[PDB]
Amino acid sequence: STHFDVIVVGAGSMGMAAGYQLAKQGVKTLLVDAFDPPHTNGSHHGDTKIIRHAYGEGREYVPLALRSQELWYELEKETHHKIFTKTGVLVFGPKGESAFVAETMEAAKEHSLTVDLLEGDEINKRWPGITVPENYNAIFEPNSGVLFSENCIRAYRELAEARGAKVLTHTRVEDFDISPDSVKIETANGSYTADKLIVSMGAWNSKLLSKLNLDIPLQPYRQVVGFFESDESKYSNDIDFPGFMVEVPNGIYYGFPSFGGCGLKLGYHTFGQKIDPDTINREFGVYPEDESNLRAFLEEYMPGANGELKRGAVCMYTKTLDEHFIIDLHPEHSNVVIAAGFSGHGFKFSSGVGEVLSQLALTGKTEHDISIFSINRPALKESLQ
């Protein structure tokens, strides 16, 4: 018998940030999650995530990245959990052969970001442990870095709960009932109503948005990461080894310096298995490519970080056809906000997205420019049932 102002379904990266923004304003909020965030069944575990400002996926993401960076610094001051370390982020690739490196460079120029440009041997010299061909160029962003994702979610949850937000864990939302003046969710643990709904179920958006009469192509992918024993005199965060996202002939890779001897962490971005979030095999090593795709990169570009595998993790990306996000009101219901398809690069923006989602839910509009994330854009291929 408890009505809420707002209900957030999926209290992960995006939902928990929204819950915190709403709670902070005194909005009576209920967050419902299938597990107990932060957990290891969605897209936010694996300990760390890169935050970059000069944006290779699109210069139009810069303001949101800069706003998110400021919000992460604010969160750092508000909690005892560690949130951000300024490792800097290095982007490199073959000169003239990487659209990713080119747009990162254009994005930095267009928004006057602070970056260092270097090439070939200058890269190897500046960061012992990296070995790239002489025809490679790079752009280094010293002020971006690494976020401790599980800590971010845990901190937003503690702060939101302290202000009255309620979080119903281990509860799967199974259906929705939307009316012009209210929303209702159905779960095995009971039904709940509110004035507004925010839907942010991550990989499960690909299976449950149909319950809101939405037919949007969303493909979940199994993406693994590995931590490798490394030469700490070269790859440690203590000796300024940077976070990185680079483009090589066979694709894009991203990584993190070793923190407190945990080993260098690496992931292969461009390849992953197409899967269903409810049947995905979350054990690292069950496919030979899990470990082999990573060592293929390490032995060539960071030879001293190709030691024993210390830990593996299996997480998911949910891609849209254009790999841009979906953040918008439901086309048929202004009282329903959708956050989906972060396509493998949404964590860094979760603080800013939480702000956008709270504004959309409370006012139906946002001060941020989110036109490129419209649920009505052609490149998405969106429609109703």
Residue 16 annotated as binding? yes
Spatial neighbors of 331 by CB under 8 A, at least 6 apart, are: 375, 376, 382, 384
Q: Map the footprint of ligand FAD across residues 358-377, applying CB under 6 A.
A: none
Residue 17 annotated as binding? yes
CA distance 305 to 58: 30
Coil, strand, or helix at residue 349? helix
Q: Does 33 bind ligand FAD (CB under 6 A)?
A: yes
What is the number of the residue whose Cβ is closest to ligand FAD?
Answer: 12
Cα 378 → chain centroid: 24
CA distance 34 to 98: 39
Binding string to ligand FAD for residues 72 to 91, with x set by CB under 6 A, is what?
--------------------
Q: Map the footprint of ligand FAD across residues 155-174, applying CB under 6 A.
A: 172-173
What is the number of the residue whose Cβ is closest to Cl ion?
Answer: 342
For residue 252, which phi and psi values (nearest 5 degrees)?
Answer: -110, 135
Structure tokens at 37: 């965030």
CB closer to Cl ion out of 226 and 341: 341
Count Cα neighbours of 86 within 13 Å in the Cβ-side half-sphere: 10
Q: Does 46 bind ligand FAD (CB under 6 A)?
A: yes
CB closer to ligand FAD out of 128 and 251: 251
User: Which of the listed partners (ligand FAD, Cl ion, none) does 225 bind, with a CB threshold of 5 to 8 Å by partner kind?
Assistant: ligand FAD
User: Which of the listed partners (Cl ion, ligand FAD, none) does 333 bind, with a CB threshold of 5 to 8 Å by partner kind?
Assistant: none
User: Which of the listed partners (ligand FAD, Cl ion, none) does 118 bind, with a CB threshold of 5 to 8 Å by partner kind?
Assistant: none
- Residue pair 165/22 in contact (Cβ under 8 Å)? The answer is yes
Q: Map the footprint of ligand FAD across residues 222-281, applying CB under 6 A.
A: 223, 225, 254, 267
Q: Map the footprint of ligand FAD across residues 331-350, applying CB under 6 A.
A: 342, 344-348
CA neighbor of 276 nearest in space, from 348, 220, 231: 220
| CB of 372 vs ligand FAD, minimal distance in Å | 16
Q: Does 12 bind ligand FAD (CB under 6 A)?
A: yes
Q: Cα dihedral sign for 234, 56, 108, 377?
A: negative
Binding string to ligand FAD for residues 177 to 216, with x set by CB under 6 A, is what?
-----------------------xxx-x---x--------
Q: Does 13 bind ligand FAD (CB under 6 A)?
A: yes
Structure tokens at 148: 């401790």
Residue 7 annotated as binding? yes
Residue 258 DSSP code: B
User: Which of the listed partners (ligand FAD, Cl ion, none) does 312 bind, with a CB threshold of 5 to 8 Å by partner kind?
Assistant: none
CA distance 325 to 75: 23
Residue 359 DSSP code: H
- Residue pair 354/17 in contact (Cβ under 8 Å)? The answer is yes
Taking CB under 6 A as the criterion, the residue among 24, 35, 78, 119 binding ligand FAD is 35
Q: Give 50-87 as a DSSP string.
A: EE-SS-TT-GGGHHHHHHHHHHHHHHHHH-SS--EE--
Known binding-site residues for FAD equal 5-35
Binding site for ligand FAD (CB under 6 A): 9-15, 32-35, 37, 42-44, 46, 49-50, 172-173, 200-202, 204, 208, 223, 225, 254, 267, 315-317, 342, 344-348
